[PDB]
Design a protein around this ligand. Structure first.
Ligand SMILES: *C/C=C1/C(=C/C2=NC(=C\c3[nH]c(/C=C4/NC(=O)C(C=C)=C4C)c(C)c3CCC(=O)O)/C(CCC(=O)O)=C2C)NC(=O)[C@H]1C
Ligand SMILES: *C/C=C1/C(=C/C2=NC(=C\c3[nH]c(/C=C4/NC(=O)C(C=C)=C4C)c(C)c3CCC(=O)O)/C(CCC(=O)O)=C2C)NC(=O)[C@H]1C
Lengths: 493, 492
């Protein structure tokens, strides 16, 4: 098997048959009696002799260590820093069970503070963040300062799966990717699945030598599943991508919001680098708190936007009761509805007359739009972020208005309060350098940030920022309020 | 102050001037240089001699201990320090805080780790996927783990009264499950302290109170013991516990929206106090309980609101195919009882009554409708005390004590009405009415029997209050019905 751009979307990266050289790996049977597999560098690091497969775990590791590892197993992978081996030495061991196999991963110990102490220091620096913007800004600076990586970013996954760089702390000499996007294909489903499963993903050396697991394919033809093994080797594609950037190493912290991958906190370094296990425990704890605090802020934000909308629509209902002419009130008031949700324009289409405000289509194109919604909707809110896919003629004005949300004012007449958004590329706040070129490998320019961003621009060409579930809930509240205004008007007139 | 039944609602329980005998207390100045106050038992427990006041902290505690405590004081809640050294080779569990201008140090003799015990308890409640399940697990779990004779959970009602919503007890004890106590049984100052402190400890309800020397200092100021866990108990509550047979207790406060949702109350029928490490764990457990309770409450609310929308959305689609909207409502009104908790429901349209479940008789509906027309401003009107608004409603208060009214029109006085029974009719009380209690000098007021009777009087002729969630559902329904009438006007 030879990974390339044709088949890399289905690469079995969970069973590479190699590990990274910053530790060694031993795979035992389910009960941890027999050594079934081992990495080739086990002899170097653990100071072991000849061939490990066939020997008992007690023989290889000692009675005392096996006893202790069986205890941690009984009580995600179990993280055991500063374990004492048979010789006069200390090792950071991680331990888990998946499929039938028990995988044991080893790292030379160092001198580290307690994980809980380090995590607690970090968490205390983001508790007082009272908005999502504040939290997202703090975290990249704080993580860079605590972990000591050259760049730290936060990606937020969009509705189509693309990633958006929403925060960045970098070395001053590096180029920026803040406000940049990458398309969904840059992270394949299998990689996303492992980001969802594992909190941390470590890469020590993008140009490092892959240490083989022996055997790669066992007596029965089965490969070793390394899904939860933190020493699992990296795809040649992503390694080439990192090399083209000049990145030698990385660590990701996954952000889990609704049991789903909201994004990543991505730490990159421009020379080989790995954190010790105790600092990785703390990073995992910090990631957990970051995700919870983000979720609280995100709800508070949502609740405040919905309540704002209700308060505005409530005020509008009371004003409207004192008006004999409802069409006139809307002609004067419609632009105030733009305040209810993010939009670049709003307009009123009543009795074949157009009144616009902000970035809208020209008045010639509105009849076509209103006619489409009349056929497409069943008398409730219709919305899209890709007008050209629905109405080919809309491509002409896509720069000014690529998306549309229509609120019906009547089930009899073809009247609408319309909301609009610009082409998403028009609202780019990219802080990067367009003259930054990139080195390439055998795969070519595909594996560079320049070409990734350009591919993303193509994926969203003639499209706007999608209408969120929150926006649609506000739209429904607005429709409902206007039905109420019309009915109370009918009652008294 | 000599507290009694006349004035116990305003008792300054934050400044009793005494502590409980299971530890000793030392009060220092703001910078922890000088000893200003000390409890009378400090000599016994700490092995010190003479009047401790006027001596330096360095003198009384030694140079090392003072240095270590000053470091802890830099680390907003009492610092808990288990297994601390005094240089006799004596271990003490020390709690430490600053409040007002006073540093308070509290000592207990020492005797597993907190994170391990809390961890085991939390794992036993993580998988609860309903408020009912969490509440039921927790009393059994806490009882088994902390070894108390009874564990209860109270949920505070909107009027301040507490309801016993869960219970784990010794089999020979009486049950208080499904019982209520009135707001007056926990005064505002006690509530404020329950909100401020996660744990409240009572080692001995018949134990002798150790005075704090001095109770009133040269300046005339008392010692504020609001965050001191050794703070002594009111004589009123001690008498209350003695009447029950309870000798000791530990409360864990449940905080939901920065507000006292309830307590996890542990009672014991002989003296009892948990060591500091176990109390740390209980505090950690209480924190998780509160968070997990909050997550389940939101899920429960979200599901009820979405259910209501799905029903109302279905009703809108069906109504589009009906030429007669009055007829549709006459056939469908009883289905609206599924939207929110209620004991009855009825339609009042064109001076015609159609009822279902526990409602007032048709005779009384004109009076009720007329009152809502005058009281409301065209939106949802609701009460849980009909007698207070309409005296004549006392006649049918047994059947219908609370009402929620949804206006169907601003021209006509038409309504969809929702009813609830007298709250005493829906009691599910598992206790024994034949269980009597002994009394002290204050009398039978300080007994569970009289408390429950007092609560019954406070809610007489009233129903379960209409919650903010019930009101949101009502507003969704009103709005839905307006849209039905409007779309009906459009095509007819
Ligand atoms: C056909 C397969 C491709 C592919 C596979 C993998 N990508 C993995 C990681 C990865 N890739 C990116 C993409 C980026 N796009 C950018 O524009 C950009 C910077 C400007 C980056 C860094 C990201 C963000 C990630 C993960 C997060 C991170 O490290 O920052 C990956 C997993 C690697 C692993 O095993 O750890 C695989 C496999 N990437 C492709 O582009 C295509 C062709
Ligand atoms: C005029 C003042 C009164 C008063 C004061 C205090 N009550 C405190 C605690 C307390 N009291 C109760 C009431 C109960 N009513 C019951 O029916 C009942 C059993 C079925 C009980 C236990 C409760 C629930 C509590 C909470 C503590 C616990 O559950 O153990 C209190 C604070 C004591 C302290 O310092 O810790 C004060 C002060 N209680 C009265 O009844 C009146 C008259």
């Amino acid at each position: 098997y030879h990974v390339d751009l044709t088949n890399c979307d289905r690469e079995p990266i969970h069973i590479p048959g190699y590990i990274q050289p910053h530790g060694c790996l031993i795979a035992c049977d389910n009960a941890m009696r027999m050594v079934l597999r081992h990495s080739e560098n086990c002899g170097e690091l653990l100071g072991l002799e000849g061939d490990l497969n066939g020997r008992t775990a007690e023989d290889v590791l000692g009675k005392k260590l096996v006893h202790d590892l069986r205890n941690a197993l009984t009580v995600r992978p179990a993280m055991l820093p500063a374990m004492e081996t048979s010789d006069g030495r200390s090792f950071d061991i991680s331990l888990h069970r998946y499929k039938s196999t028990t995988i044991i991963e080893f790292e030379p110990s160092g001198s580290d503070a307690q994980p809980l102490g380090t995590a607690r220091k970090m968490v205390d620096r983001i508790r007082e963040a009272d908005s999502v913007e504040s939290l997202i800004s703090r975290t990249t600076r704080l993580v860079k300062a605590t972990l000591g990586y050259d760049r730290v970013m936060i990606y937020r996954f969009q509705e189509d799966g693309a990633g958006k760089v929403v925060s960045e702390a970098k070395q001053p000499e590096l180029e920026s990717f803040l406000g940049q996007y990458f398309p969904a294909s840059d992270i394949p489903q299998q990689a996303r699945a492992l980001y969802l499963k594992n909190t941390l993903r470590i890469i020590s050396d993008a140009s490092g030598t892959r240490i083989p697991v022996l055997p790669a394919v066992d007596v029965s033809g089965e490969p070793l599943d390394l899904s939860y093994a933190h020493l699992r080797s990296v795809s040649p594609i992503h390694c080439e991508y990192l090399r083209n950037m000049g990145v030698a190493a990385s660590m990701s912290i996954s952000v889990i919001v609704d049991g789903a991958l909201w994004g990543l906190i991505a730490c990159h370094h421009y020379s080989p680098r790995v954190l010790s296990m105790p600092v990785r425990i703390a990073a995992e704890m910090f990631g957990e708190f970051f995700s919870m605090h983000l979720q609280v802020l995100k709800q508070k934000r949502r609740l405040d936007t919905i309540n704002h909308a209700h308060a505005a629509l409530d005020r509008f209902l009371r004003l409207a009761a004192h008006h004999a002419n409802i069409e006139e009130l809307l002609v004067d008031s419609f632009q105030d509805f733009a305040d209810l949700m993010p939009c670049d324009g709003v307009g009123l289409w009543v009795g074949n007359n157009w009144h616009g405000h902000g970035a809208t289509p020209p008045h010639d194109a509105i009849p076509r739009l209103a006619r489409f919604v009349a056929s497409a909707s069943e008398g409730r809110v219709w919305a899209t972020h890709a007008l050209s896919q629905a109405i080919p003629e809309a491509e002409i004005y896509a720069g000014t208005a690529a998306g549309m949300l229509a609120i019906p004012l009547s089930q009899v007449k073809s009247d609408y309060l319309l909301f609009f958004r610009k082409e998403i590329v028009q609202n780019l706040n990219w802080a990067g350098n367009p003259e930054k070129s990139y080195e390439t490998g055998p795969m070519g320019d595909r594996l560079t940030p320049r070409k990734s961003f350009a591919i993303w621009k193509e994926t969203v060409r003639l499209q706007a920022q999608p209408w969120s579930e929150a926006d649609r809930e506000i739209a429904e509240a607005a429709r409902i309020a206007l039905v109420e205004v019309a009915f109370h008007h009918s009652e008294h007139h």
